[PDB]
């Protein structure tokens, strides 16, 4: 009884959102899982470093915002920052 | 044990054609064989280190993925 | 009690907020973790996935196909500046290369 | 009899192999080479199939990138033939020799 | 007004061991501090990764040994491994 | 009772207790063994002694008695394994290695 | 404000930097080119540095921010902490 | 009738002189003004420590020296001794910066 968690169903939801009638193979889905894991580890490592530099003991939204700004370029950084900010305000105001 | 002549000359010429090369000298084949053997032993050393640390005998795909990632050559697709 | 409306639905996302929270805790990144950090990270990850998937789907529909394969992901990544510069040092299995021949090698 | 001029089949092959995604080395020779190389670090190792598949993907990507760099170094000197000194210059600049 | 720890005195002891009558400037000592910190963080990060891969919760001597082997080349790896092993046996047998 | 420290127990010059504390506080794992700080201290001391011996030989070669960053750079760049361990670092006030291509020389 | 300071990197300074690199003969078009390169480099570091400074809610750029930026771009620097 | 060195002599002498030394090769004040101008383009009303600008100077000089070495190699590859912009572009392309 050994499981194996993955982001397959969430990637599938996003795909059905942006392309309602296109599918995806299994190897492309493995590529997408690898991509999500890689970017997650990058952002989390950078935020941990930022928290250590300032002698803080907590990872908050500002650490994630600054890590996003340090990692993504230009268009990507701007739009990701806007998306995350909107998400956090929508979450707290609910 | 010339398993390095297993990489034939037409194979190297195919690899060159994919890279956009239009003409190939005759001394290129030995050079690429040397380069490839260097790269391969560099990767396999760390793969076997990762393996024997875990007290296993079978080299797994994740060991190769880690050995590559530590060289700065991340590889997507075998993360399962 | 009440209906357990979760967290990703609260934030209006598709990605899991609780799983990202657990991964941030267990991954040994800091000794405490805020409440908005998983929401922010989930939103960013969903945005990036949607971007790359839209590009890949356009490529797939361009080659008269209905199902994305790794070649389409490679064509999407390598053809965009910011993605190619974010993923400049990754190898996609079964991806191939970009069709490109130097001008001096052509005849005439 | 019909004969193409030297260089036509070259560009035809270039387009063909840049349109494709296959592997360009045969699998059994590469497997034997990998096992022989691993023979010196530890004896009696086993390999999954996905391990050798990953090694092959990585090696082919590396070599194709090196050949692009070599082609640039060749064109810089006003040639069309790649020679070993172009490979040496590309690797020296990348830092792989230095 | 808070103190600032450093490896100055230990580097000085090692220097007086290998070169009994040579001194060292202050800028070279800052270089040596930077070097020690950098190598420490490299080894510790690699050992942490190794411990995470095997689902272990403890950093032991084997993790440090494997990190040393993965980071240093040839001569350096061999001699560092021998030195650390001797140190650990000397420590436990005391 | 009488308290002898850990670095003296292991026969080292570097601090074992400080390395233990840095391994704990640095958030690397949730537990830390007893021999890990000893191993790490021994490795760090070995590397420092290696690089310092090379730098001192360079300094005594240029008829000086006190090591400066130039000597550290000359030691690092002249050894294969050190230059390949530290291939991507910049040492302030270090300079470069004297080296002129052969084709640029006259005649 | 201050504008047009890339010209303060004079031709003799670039010639000296090239001499330390082993260069014997220098084209006349190099200087301009070089300046462009340098500017790009600085813009990539300072940006990162400033991103650290605003994170701590500071207003002065310290040497540690520069060292962190250089390290995160794979250009580690020994001597300043 | 006055003494004149042949072209290339003072250049080699200067090569030896500047490879034997460790000083900085750019004036401090122009570099500081340049750094402040760029920073002002990024965020207004900034301040700087002295060690920060010193670190920036050391890093930038090291970068440019390494680039000039790679450029010299690319130039010698083409059977020249004069470095030209296309060599800088080839070096920066093989390195992976453009």
Swiss-Prot record, chains A, E:
<feature type="modified residue" description="N6-(2-hydroxyisobutyryl)lysine; alternate">
    <location>
        <position position="78"/>
    </location>
</feature>
<dbReference type="GO" id="GO:0030527">
    <property type="term" value="F:structural constituent of chromatin"/>
</dbReference>
<keyword id="KW-0158">Chromosome</keyword>
<feature type="modified residue" description="N6-(2-hydroxyisobutyryl)lysine; alternate">
    <location>
        <position position="16"/>
    </location>
</feature>
<feature type="modified residue" description="N6-succinyllysine; alternate">
    <location>
        <position position="90"/>
    </location>
</feature>
<feature type="modified residue" description="N6-methyllysine; alternate">
    <location>
        <position position="16"/>
    </location>
</feature>
<keyword id="KW-0832">Ubl conjugation</keyword>
<feature type="modified residue" description="N6-glutaryllysine; alternate">
    <location>
        <position position="16"/>
    </location>
</feature>
<feature type="modified residue" description="N6-methylated lysine; alternate">
    <location>
        <position position="86"/>
    </location>
</feature>
<dbReference type="GO" id="GO:0046982">
    <property type="term" value="F:protein heterodimerization activity"/>
</dbReference>
<feature type="cross-link" description="Glycyl lysine isopeptide (Lys-Gly) (interchain with G-Cter in ubiquitin); alternate">
    <location>
        <position position="90"/>
    </location>
</feature>
<feature type="modified residue" description="Phosphoserine; by AMPK">
    <location>
        <position position="6"/>
    </location>
</feature>
Swiss-Prot record, chain F:
<dbReference type="GO" id="GO:0008285">
    <property type="term" value="P:negative regulation of cell population proliferation"/>
</dbReference>
<keyword id="KW-0544">Nucleosome core</keyword>
<dbReference type="GO" id="GO:0003677">
    <property type="term" value="F:DNA binding"/>
</dbReference>
<keyword id="KW-0488">Methylation</keyword>
<keyword id="KW-0379">Hydroxylation</keyword>
<comment type="subunit">
    <text>The nucleosome is a histone octamer containing two molecules each of H2A, H2B, H3 and H4 assembled in one H3-H4 heterotetramer and two H2A-H2B heterodimers. The octamer wraps approximately 147 bp of DNA.</text>
</comment>
<keyword id="KW-1017">Isopeptide bond</keyword>
<feature type="modified residue" description="N6-(2-hydroxyisobutyryl)lysine; alternate">
    <location>
        <position position="84"/>
    </location>
</feature>
<feature type="modified residue" description="N6-crotonyllysine; alternate">
    <location>
        <position position="25"/>
    </location>
</feature>
<feature type="modified residue" description="N6-(2-hydroxyisobutyryl)lysine; alternate">
    <location>
        <position position="25"/>
    </location>
</feature>
<dbReference type="GO" id="GO:0043505">
    <property type="term" value="C:CENP-A containing nucleosome"/>
</dbReference>
<feature type="modified residue" description="N6-(2-hydroxyisobutyryl)lysine">
    <location>
        <position position="63"/>
    </location>
</feature>
From Swiss-Prot, chain G:
<dbReference type="GO" id="GO:0003723">
    <property type="term" value="F:RNA binding"/>
</dbReference>
<feature type="modified residue" description="N6-(beta-hydroxybutyryl)lysine; alternate">
    <location>
        <position position="57"/>
    </location>
</feature>
<feature type="modified residue" description="N6-lactoyllysine; alternate">
    <location>
        <position position="57"/>
    </location>
</feature>
<dbReference type="GO" id="GO:0030527">
    <property type="term" value="F:structural constituent of chromatin"/>
</dbReference>
<keyword id="KW-0225">Disease variant</keyword>
<dbReference type="GO" id="GO:0005634">
    <property type="term" value="C:nucleus"/>
</dbReference>
<dbReference type="GO" id="GO:0016020">
    <property type="term" value="C:membrane"/>
</dbReference>
<feature type="modified residue" description="N6-glutaryllysine; alternate">
    <location>
        <position position="57"/>
    </location>
</feature>
<dbReference type="GO" id="GO:0006334">
    <property type="term" value="P:nucleosome assembly"/>
</dbReference>
<feature type="modified residue" description="N6-acetyllysine; alternate">
    <location>
        <position position="71"/>
    </location>
</feature>
<keyword id="KW-0238">DNA-binding</keyword>
<keyword id="KW-0544">Nucleosome core</keyword>
UniProtKB/Swiss-Prot annotation, chain H:
<dbReference type="GO" id="GO:0005634">
    <property type="term" value="C:nucleus"/>
</dbReference>
<dbReference type="GO" id="GO:0010467">
    <property type="term" value="P:gene expression"/>
</dbReference>
<keyword id="KW-0832">Ubl conjugation</keyword>
<feature type="modified residue" description="N6-glutaryllysine; alternate">
    <location>
        <position position="79"/>
    </location>
</feature>
<dbReference type="GO" id="GO:0032200">
    <property type="term" value="P:telomere organization"/>
</dbReference>
<dbReference type="GO" id="GO:0006334">
    <property type="term" value="P:nucleosome assembly"/>
</dbReference>
<feature type="modified residue" description="N6-methyllysine; by EHMT2; alternate">
    <location>
        <position position="20"/>
    </location>
</feature>
<feature type="modified residue" description="N6-(beta-hydroxybutyryl)lysine; alternate">
    <location>
        <position position="20"/>
    </location>
</feature>
<keyword id="KW-0539">Nucleus</keyword>
<feature type="modified residue" description="N6-crotonyllysine; alternate">
    <location>
        <position position="20"/>
    </location>
</feature>
<keyword id="KW-0379">Hydroxylation</keyword>
<feature type="modified residue" description="N6-glutaryllysine; alternate">
    <location>
        <position position="43"/>
    </location>
</feature>
